[PDB]
């Protein structure tokens, strides 16, 4: 809820105050360690810092700009992942969290 449903409205002000060097560059220049470092910093400087599962959190990539309905970094391609555990995969699980990431793209 904090990240994907953006209940933290003080998180992404940092992300946009930081990632403008990403949010503009042409295709295939994707750099995920930089994105993970941007997440780690945009976490730390904000109050977003404070929750314990932020480290279970990740930056992932999405190929499609909502055209799944039927870099050019971030705007078409952001994703996050609270990583699965096989004991937990019976409830909170990647295969289902795909639908959840679509809501987050829109928000």
């Amino acid at each position: 809820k904090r990240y994907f449903l953006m209940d933290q409205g003080d998180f992404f002000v940092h992300f946009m105050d930081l990632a403008e060097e990403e949010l503009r560059k042409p295709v295939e220049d994707i750099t995920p360690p930089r994105l993970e470092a941007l997440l780690e910093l945009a976490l730390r400087m904000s109050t977003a810092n404070t929750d314990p599962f932020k480290d279970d959190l990740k930056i992932d990539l999405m190929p499609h700009d909502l055209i799944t309905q039927l870099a050019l970094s971030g705007l078409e391609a952001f994703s996050f992942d609270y990583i699965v555990k096989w004991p937990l995969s019976l409830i909170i699980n990647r295969k289902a969290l795909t639908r959840y990431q679509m809501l987050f793209r829109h928000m």
């Binding site: 799944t68 039927l70 295969k95 795909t98 639908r99 679509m102």
Partner: protein
């Protein structure tokens, strides 16, 4: 002749939800 009206304004929704929900499941299933 008659319908409840409250039947229509639900019987759309119970199909409508799982319809596009199944859609969105299947996009990733096409591989």
């Amino acid at each position: 002749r008659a319908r409840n009206m409250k039947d229509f304004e639900n019987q759309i929704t119970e199909l409508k939800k799982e319809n596009f929900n199944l859609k969105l499941r299947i996009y990733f299933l096409e591989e």
